[PDB]
């Protein structure tokens, strides 16, 4: 189906027994009433395309995913900056992604790093991908920055932004943003279930970054992560959320102060 | 020739007089796990009779100020019968389900219900606190209601932040008291893993929400219950060990 | 080396850009696939699914009574029931449906629509209604004798309790922008008005107030174009 | 054309050929009895 | 026709009935009087080319289209700079383009950004294309700059000028700079018709630009837009305007102080 | 030669082959009776 | 990479230059064409 | 020269990267091989 | 073998004579007891890959090898900085490499040079590879820096890091990190054997670096060496060291203060 | 594909084709009498 649909010429009917406009909705099915079994239409050939509305063209946008700060002070400094990789931090890509239950794709992370007031000095950075189970680096001159059996990218600030391709690395067959269950066994409390809905097969390690130098660098960088989806497959479509997001890794909403799905009108018998 | 039906599974049978056609979820029948998609090595067990039958839950009176109810299907019949006993001893589980919701009334009552399944139906906490120490989370009887069931607080947002109006994308069916008095949905095994524990993870959940209120004149009957039966089609179990409770 | 030279557009990061990237894990094979039921391939599969219209979105209404259309026994021989606009990208009843959000993601739409009503009254309650669609031009019609000159369907309350009014594509151009008025009234679609045909008659000892549920979906010729950001979310708290 | 990859891996390429397989009856008509177009849904 | 035209040898005629030099102009036709039906010519073969005079070689020039300012002050600043995309702002490309009624083409917009006094410091910019219906960004750190499902270009000042290809995106079949009509319905006034001639199928969104930074940048940039036409098709040629342009989106001229199409001579009986 | 494009789109290329189809009689002689070259336009 | 080297004329913006550019809308099909009478193809049609 | 342009990821040193390098000794042939018993080819030979 | 292994359906046996679970370990062989000669299994086809666990994918990591300082003072300066090429200086690549006895491979040395406090000024460097037997340069303006019949690399600090390919250059057929023997003849002492275990066929010359200038440069550089293995073949696998390294070119350990191979438990009859 | 080298030398290329020759019986069963799978190792 490279185009939308064509309409065949129709005419009028005056006879009993054939009722196409009485599709019962109690059956759970969608009404299959076409134009040709209704008001008299003409012959039109439609050449409008359906290529843009596909999933692969709908999820091939980058969007912002994470913002990582790097203070690099002089007396209360940290040096490194870890950031756990998750996409449920910015409600735009999350709202676009949470209209399905199970997804599977590849990523094209792009890292854009700038300075506080805005400037690009030729300082060399080091982006490190720490998988789950590998030790996290503690310090700007730690032992973990040797990057042996560990992927890393060396790029400067004046260079174009780096861009690496990340495969599908979940231990299960697909991703899922809705896990109605519990990660452990035993007795579960009733007051505060901080373990309910915790997606087990979604953790993907921690992203790290430091500045390659000896002493220090009096600068405050701020890098942004842009993740593009590709080779994506979606299952079990879910309705789109109509409530404002409130938490990072828990779908919640305000019990009072509920937002309606539509705006208000003056009267029901008025279209304006 | 279509408003009558007799569903027989095992040693149970469900007869009806006013019914619509059965709803088959996503066009897929429940089938056994193929050897290509499997990942375990131990041979799974298949009782095929004692765990494949219509288990009837309790009935709930549908008043005028009712909001709705929901269940978790690999948790409701998790303590009742051979299915529950077989699911407490094993670690892996895979099955489909056949659904049937009864709600009859006279030809003078009015109202309509919406019965549908929601895969991965995660319950949302209700509150306006963003601190991790006071953020409200649902309890265990709210997440896993058991064989009894749980009620809704804000059924307009499905108690999940998702609007009820768009919930027609799920496999659904209506119970309109002027058209029929029962609704039937057959659902296959929907998961991103071949086998999964039937205790620490509910696959999906049934929901009954009256959108059109129940109305009747003074003098008619006033007890209108909602009865639900569940058939675990094509059950498989693996990883045999000691029996756990929860 | 090869005597190459650079062109404009060098060292830019285009967001909608299909280009190969460097793999981080060499010699990697992912987890095999399994059969998951209910796979989607386009967003046109979701717009062809009926979803409840929110016609009673005015005030003095709670969440559940916001999706119902009240039907009673009018004393005047002919009266007007609920009415609403057609454009699914406009703030109103088409905002509570899935096709409305899908069309809010994109910016231009074509193709015909479908609005399917459903009567949730009693069995002994009968009656007839007139659902009518009207292309642009003048304002909402005042009486039925003006509104029935367009595309209309006479509906009855029988054993089958749902009618499907189809909204034909009567636009002058090929595509309409999903945008409200001002100077953009050029892309308006029309008004769907629901009228009382005969009455809502009911026997005694029977409630005389029913409700009609309105649902809406898309047709086979429904097609979308240029994608953009939605306007359902502008502000966000730091999560 | 279409920016074929230059790598040993297969996930580091761009978007492959499109696939127009819609099959929309799995969501719109998920019933067992095939409802005819010109008929009553209930007898 | 790769060349212009060839001339066949002619001779003299002395006979009655054949008059090629009496083409009546009341018929609305152009005189078809050639050289061979007139003064005695010779045999010449013409190899002069007609390739440069085509429409595709006549409209493949860039020219200036728009100038966008960006003050970026400290206390009364704006940050962003929107500019609605229209080509009726500079009379050169407008005069070249308004000799036809209906056109259809593709664009090759090029953005050249400089500083006030003239300098190229390595500040990174962000060019955003907001289609009609998308919200306009308000502020240099607004929510709309996430560019999810929105095309944008990130380039510096020291880099070569950016250049993107824009397709034909009108809802109709072709463009038109002359719409003798009204966009709405109802009653129209007689004093001030500010809605007459408003081209409905020509609005193409708004172009936006800001500086990617955190605090501010004490600089006043000024970017210029150069639009090249390609794949162009023209219909219904119109006469070229002979009056000076006065308004942006309305063809007007001064009633008094009219400009003649030709200059003045001393006498009619004198060629100099 | 002629700078073929490297993209999936078709509008992002350069100018294609030329077309010398003038057909100038649609503006110079838009009449119904074909006026001969050696004749009077009115009889 | 391929051992290339640059030549004079790099990083210049020539106005009369036929070169491919990057598309902003990927996977885009425009509005179909209709028959409009009075199409021109050269400016020699107007001088005659 | 060929009208090329650069992409993101330029001038980066990826550790796990299979790319050709410049030889320091041109026209070099190493010491020939001999048969050494006990050659391994994968780390699965050691876990068994 | 592109995948791991498949399991055939098994069943139960009730008969005498066949005992697959009684593999005697006194024979020095590994028990060949499979799943199908044991508890009843099913039919599974395994598509898990064994490509990543190969030697060529296990040794194709760069890791750090050497750190070379360059003071370049004013009155007690040196100018040059020699560094003998050996990989037994950093215990990560050494621990990964010392699980085999004989190896043979090619190298892809990469040189990353930075400044003391961290900065990249455009100073040109000169990396020199001095083979064994060639004279070592003494001074920043010595005679040996002419690089005639000697490979060298000229690169700046602002340039990307240099990367050269080094072949297999041992006089023997393969490398070896364990030489149980003596390099010379005669009588060997009993008190201090500083010549025991000295690998004769492993010395590969000395790496050198200076700054190309005339007078001096008040800067303190610090270059790092990253050696990637390729075309690698391993023989005679050895057990992995469980003791902390103590010396550069001698395997030693602390007689007292011995580290156990595993951590401690509370009791033997308890899994936690 | 696979980044073939552009040089006269052969050691300056990238990793060549893989080789899945395991042969693990040289370490697990280095004995002379081939022990059968269903038998006693000592008689």
DSSP secondary structure letters along chain C: -------TTTT---SS-----EESSSS---PPP---S-EE-BTHHHHTS-EE--TT-SSS--SGGGG-EEE---SSSS-EEEEEE--TTSSSGGGSSHHHHHHHHBSEEES-EEEEEEE-S-SS-EEEEEEEEE-SSSSS-SSHHHHTTSEEEEEE-SSS-EEEEEE----SSS-EE---STT-GGG---EEEEEEEEEEE--SSS-S-EEEEEEEEE-TT-EE-SB---SS-------
Neighbours of A259 (CB within 10 A): 13
Which stretches within I45-189 are classed as H helix?
Answer: 55-58, 91-97
Question: Which of I63, I65, I69, I64 lies closest to I82, judged by CA?
Answer: I69
Which DSSP helix (H) or strand (E) runs through A176? strand A175-176
With contact defined as beta carbons under 8 Å apart, do I208 and I111 qualify? no
Question: How long, in residues, is chain F?
Answer: 43
Cα of first residue to Cα of last residue in chain J, in angstroms, is 58
Question: Which of B1, B176, B208 lies closest to C157, judged by CA?
Answer: B176
- In Å, the largest CA–CA distance within chain C is 96
B5 near D CB under 8 A = no
Q: Which two tokens stand for residue A57?
A: 């063209």
Report the alpha-carbon distance of residue E131 to residue A92 in Å, rounded.
Answer: 18
J29 near I CB under 8 A = yes
The gap from C-alpha A112 to its chain's centroid, in whole angstroms, comes to 19
Contact H18 J15 (CB under 8 A): yes
Report the alpha-carbon distance of residue C92 to residue C82 in Å, rounded.
Answer: 13
Interface residues of chain I, partner chain A, Cβ below 8 Å = 61-64, 90, 92-93, 96, 112, 114-118, 120, 158, 161, 222
Burial of I92 (0-12, 13-18, 19+ CB in 10 A): middle
Burial of A267 (0-12, 13-18, 19+ CB in 10 A): exposed
Report the alpha-carbon distance of residue C102 to residue B221 in Å, rounded.
Answer: 45
Report the number of distinct structural domains present in chain B.
1
Contact G28 F11 (CB under 8 A): yes
- What is the bridge-based pairing of β-strands E162-165 and G22-23? parallel
> Reduced to 3 states, what is the DSSP secondary structure of residue A126?
strand
Look up tokens 């200036």; give the residue.
E64
Q: Which two tokens stand for residue A185?
A: 């066994």
Q: Which two tokens stand for residue D25?
A: 């009856």
DSSP letter at H42 equals B
Question: How long, in residues, is chain B?
Answer: 246
The domain in which residue A47 lies consists of: 1-272
- Nearest Cβ partner for B168 among C51, C62, C63: C51
Report the alpha-carbon distance of residue A126 to residue A208 in Å, rounded.
Answer: 8
b vs e for C74-95, b when ≥16 Cβ sit within 10 Å of the residue's Cβ? eeeeeebbbbbbbbbbbbbbbb
Å between H41 CA and nearest CA of chain C: 16
With contact defined as beta carbons under 8 Å apart, do F16 and E105 qualify? no
Burial of J6 (0-12, 13-18, 19+ CB in 10 A): exposed
Considering only CA atoms, give the Rg of chain D.
21
Considering only CA atoms, give the Rg of chain A.
27
Interface of I with H in 229-248 (CB under 8 A): 233-237
Contact C20 D3 (CB under 8 A): yes
Residue of G8, G25, G33 to mutate, interface with C, max C Cβ within 10 Å:
G25
Report the number of distinct structural domains present in chain E.
1
Which DSSP helix (H) or strand (E) runs through E222? strand E221-226
Contact H32 I173 (CB under 8 A): yes
Phi/psi at A54 (5° precision): -75, 165
Considering only CA atoms, give the Rg of chain E.
27
> Reduced to 3 states, what is the DSSP secondary structure of residue A143?
helix
Look up tokens 């966000």; give the residue.
C236
The gap from C-alpha B195 to its chain's centroid, in whole angstroms, comes to 19
* Chain D: residue whose CA lies nearest to A24: D41
With contact defined as beta carbons under 8 Å apart, do B196 and B39 qualify? no
Experimental technique, in short, is cryo-EM
Å between C34 CA and nearest CA of chain I: 13
- Nearest Cβ partner for D28 among A18, A30, A34: A30
Neighbours of B136 (CB within 10 A): 16
Q: Is F25 left (phi over 0), alpha (psi -120 to 50) or beta?
A: alpha
Instruction: Calculate ∠ Cα J21-J22-J28, nearest 5°.
Output: 155
The domain in which residue F22 lies consists of: 1-43
Which stretches within chain B are classed as H helix?
Answer: 73-76, 82-89, 140-143
Q: Which two tokens stand for residue I134?
A: 């060639």
Report the alpha-carbon distance of residue B165 to residue B182 in Å, rounded.
Answer: 22
> Reduced to 3 states, what is the DSSP secondary structure of residue E92?
helix
Report the alpha-carbon distance of residue E43 to residue E61 in Å, rounded.
Answer: 38
Beta bridge partners of I162: I111
Report the number of distinct structural domains present in chain J.
1
Which DSSP helix (H) or strand (E) runs through E56? helix E55-58
The domain in which residue B64 lies consists of: 1-246
Residues 6+ apart with CB under 8 A from B1: D43
Report the alpha-carbon distance of residue B142 to residue B75 in Å, rounded.
Answer: 12
Question: How long, in residues, is chain H?
Answer: 48
Cβ contacts below 8 Å, chain I against chain J, sum to 60
Report the alpha-carbon distance of residue B84 to residue B76 in Å, rounded.
Answer: 9
Residue of I39, I40, I44 to mutate, interface with B, max B Cβ within 10 Å:
I44
Question: Which of I148, I116, I123, I124 lies closest to I135, judged by CA?
Answer: I148
Q: Which two tokens stand for residue H23?
A: 């030889």
Q: How many helices (H) and strands (E) would you count in chain D?
A: 1, 0
Residues 6+ apart with CB under 8 A from I74: I216, I218
Question: Which of A266, A171, C13 lies closest to E156, judged by CA?
Answer: C13
Contact I49 C32 (CB under 8 A): no
Report the alpha-carbon distance of residue C193 to residue C69 in Å, rounded.
Answer: 13
Side-by-side strand order, sheet with C22-23: A64-70, A221-226, A110-115, A162-165, C22-23
- What is the bridge-based pairing of β-strands A162-165 and C22-23? parallel
- In Å, the largest CA–CA distance within chain B is 64
Report the alpha-carbon distance of residue I219 to residue E187 in Å, rounded.
Answer: 82
Instruction: Calculate ∠ Cα B190-B194-B197, nearest 5°.
Output: 85
Which DSSP helix (H) or strand (E) runs through F27? helix F25-28
Residues 6+ apart with CB under 8 A from A197: A178, A179, A180, A181, A249, A250, A251, B122
Report the alpha-carbon distance of residue E210 to residue E140 in Å, rounded.
Answer: 6
Contact B42 I42 (CB under 8 A): yes
Residues 6+ apart with CB under 8 A from I191: none
Look up tokens 């690009």; give the residue.
A120
Report the alpha-carbon distance of residue C80 to residue C24 in Å, rounded.
Answer: 65
Phi/psi at C216 (5° precision): -150, 145
Beta bridge partners of I207: I83, I129
Q: Do chains A and B touch (3 or more CB pairs under 8 A)?
A: yes
Residue of B2, B64, B165 to mutate, interface with C, max C Cβ within 10 Å:
B165
Torsion from C-alpha of I240, I245, I251, I254, nearest 10 degrees: -110
Which DSSP helix (H) or strand (E) runs through G44? helix G44-47
Neighbours of A215 (CB within 10 A): 10
Cβ contacts below 8 Å, chain A against chain E, sum to 43
Report the alpha-carbon distance of residue C39 to residue B13 in Å, rounded.
Answer: 33
DSSP letter at D28 equals H
Contact D24 C22 (CB under 8 A): no
Report the alpha-carbon distance of residue C157 to residue C174 in Å, rounded.
Answer: 37
Question: Which of A49, A39, A40, A59 lies closest to A4, judged by CA?
Answer: A49
Question: Which of I254, I255, I253, I104 lies closest to I173, judged by CA?
Answer: I104
Report the alpha-carbon distance of residue A191 to residue I208 in Å, rounded.
Answer: 68
Torsion from C-alpha of I215, I221, I222, I227, nearest 10 degrees: -70
Phi/psi at E211 (5° precision): -110, 130
J4 near I CB under 8 A = no
Report the alpha-carbon distance of residue J21 to residue J23 in Å, rounded.
Answer: 6
Q: Spell out which residues of chain C touch residue E145, defining contact as CB-CB under 8 Å.
A: none
Report the alpha-carbon distance of residue J5 to residue J16 in Å, rounded.
Answer: 11
With contact defined as beta carbons under 8 Å apart, do C211 and C72 qualify? no
* Chain G: residue whose CA lies nearest to A47: G32
Instruction: Calculate ∠ Cα E102-E103-E107, nearest 5°.
Output: 155
With contact defined as beta carbons under 8 Å apart, do C98 and C154 qualify? no
Q: Which two tokens stand for residue B3?
A: 């408003």
Resolution to 1 decimal, in Å? 3.0
Residues 6+ apart with CB under 8 A from C12: E153, E154, E155, E159, E162
Which DSSP helix (H) or strand (E) runs through D26? helix D25-28
């Amino acid at each position: 189906a490279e185009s939308a649909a064509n309409t065949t010429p129709s005419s009028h009917r005056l006879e009993t027994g054939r009722v196409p406009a009485l599709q019962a909705a109690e059956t759970g099915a969608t009404s299959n009433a076409t134009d040709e079994n209704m008001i008299e239409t003409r012959c039109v050939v439609n050449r409008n395309g359906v290529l843009e509305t596909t999933i692969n063209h709908f999820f091939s946008r980058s969007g912002l995913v994470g913002v990582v700060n790097l203070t690099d002070g002089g007396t209360d400094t940290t040096g490194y900056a870890t950031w756990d990789i998750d996409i449920m931090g910015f409600v735009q890509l999350r709202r676009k992604c949470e209209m399905f239950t199970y997804m599977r794709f590849n990523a094209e992370f792009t890292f854009v790093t700038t300075t506080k007031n805005g400037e690009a000095r030729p300082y060399m950075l080091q982006y490190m991908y720490v998988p789950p189970g590998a030790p996290k680096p503690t310090g700007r001159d730690a032992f973990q920055w040797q990057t042996a059996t560990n992927p890393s990218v060396f790029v400067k600030l004046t260079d174009p932004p780096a861009q690496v391709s990340v495969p599908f690395m979940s231990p299960a067959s697909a991703y899922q943003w809705f896990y109605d269950g519990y990660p452990t066994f035993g007795q579960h409390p009733e007051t505060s279930n901080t373990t309910y809905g915790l997606c087990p097969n979604n953790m993907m390690g921690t992203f790290a970054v430091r500045v390659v130098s000896r002493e220090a660098s009096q600068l405050k960088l701020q890098t942004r992560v842009y993740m593009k989806l590709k080779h994506v497959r979606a299952w079990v479509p879910r309705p789109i959320r109509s409530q404002p997001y409130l938490l990072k890794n828990f779908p919640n909403y305000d019990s009072s102060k509920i937002t309606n799905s539509a705006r208000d009108r003056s009267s029901i018998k008025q279209a304006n | 020739s279509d408003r009558v039906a007799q569903l027989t599974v095992g040693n149970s049978s469900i007869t009806t007089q006013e019914a619509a056609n059965i709803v088959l979820a996503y066009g897929e029948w429940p089938e056994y796990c193929p050897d290509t998609d499997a990942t375990a090595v131990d041979k799974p067990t298949r009782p095929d009779v004692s765990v494949n039958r219509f288990y009837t839950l309790d009935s709930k009176m549908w008043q005028e100020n009712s909001t709705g109810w929901y269940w978790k299907f690999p948790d409701v019949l998790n303590k009742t019968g051979v299915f529950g006993q077989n699911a407490q001893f094993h670690y892996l589980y895979r099955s489909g389900f056949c659904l049937h919701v009864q709600c009859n009334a006279s030809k003078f009552h009015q109202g309509a219900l919406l019965v549908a399944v929601i895969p991965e139906f995660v319950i949302a906490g209700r509150g306006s606190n963003t601190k991790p120490n006071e953020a409200p989370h649902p309890g265990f009887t709210t997440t896993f209601p058991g064989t009894t069931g749980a009620t809704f607080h804000d059924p307009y947002v499905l108690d999940s932040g998702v609007p009820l109006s768009q919930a027609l994308i799920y496999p659904h069916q209506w119970i309109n008291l002027r058209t029929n008095n029962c609704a039937t949905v057959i659902v296959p095994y929907i998961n991103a893993v071949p086998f999964d524990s039937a205790i620490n993870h509910s696959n999906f959940g049934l929901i009954v929400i009256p959108v059109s209120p129940l109305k009747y004149s003074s003098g008619a009957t006033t007890a209108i219950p909602i009865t639900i039966t569940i058939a675990p089609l094509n059950s498989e179990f693996g990883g045999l060990r000691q029996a756990v409770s929860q | 080396g090869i005597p190459a030279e650079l062109r404009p557009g060098t060292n830019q990061f285009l967001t909608t850009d299909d280009d190969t990237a460097a793999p981080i894990l060499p010699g990697f094979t992912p987890t095999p696939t399994i059969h998951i039921p209910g796979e989607v391939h386009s967003l046109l599969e979701l717009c062809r699914v009926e979803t409840i219209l929110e016609v009673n979105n005015t005030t003095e209404a709670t969440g559940l009574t916001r999706l119902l259309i009240p039907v009673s026994s009018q004393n005047k021989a002919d009266e007007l029931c609920a009415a609403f606009m057609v454009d699914p990208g406009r703030i109103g009843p088409w905002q509570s449906t899935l096709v409305g959000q899908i069309c809010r993601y994109y910016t231009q739409w074509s193709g015909s629509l479908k609005v399917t009503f459903m009567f949730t009254g009693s069995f002994m309650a009968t009656g007839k209604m007139l659902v009518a669609y009207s292309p642009p031009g003048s304002a909402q019609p005042a009486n039925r004798e003006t509104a029935m000159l367009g595309t209309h369907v006479i509906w009855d309350f029988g054993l089958q309790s749902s009618v499907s009014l189809v909204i034909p594509w009567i636009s002058n151009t090929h595509f309409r922008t999903a945008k409200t008025g001002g100077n953009y009234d050029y892309y308006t679609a029309g008004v769907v008005t629901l009228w009382y045909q005969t009455n809502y008659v009911v026997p005694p000892e029977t409630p005389g107030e029913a409700y009609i549920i309105a649902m809406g979906a898309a047709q086979d010729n429904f097609t979308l174009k240029i994608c953009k950001d939605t306007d359902e979310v502008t502000q966000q708290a730091v999560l | 054309f279409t920016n074929i990859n230059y790598y040993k891996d297969s996930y580091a390429a761009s978007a492959t050929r499109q696939d127009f397989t819609q099959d929309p009856k799995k969501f719109t008509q998920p019933v067992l009895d095939s409802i005819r177009e010109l008929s009553a849904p209930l007898n």
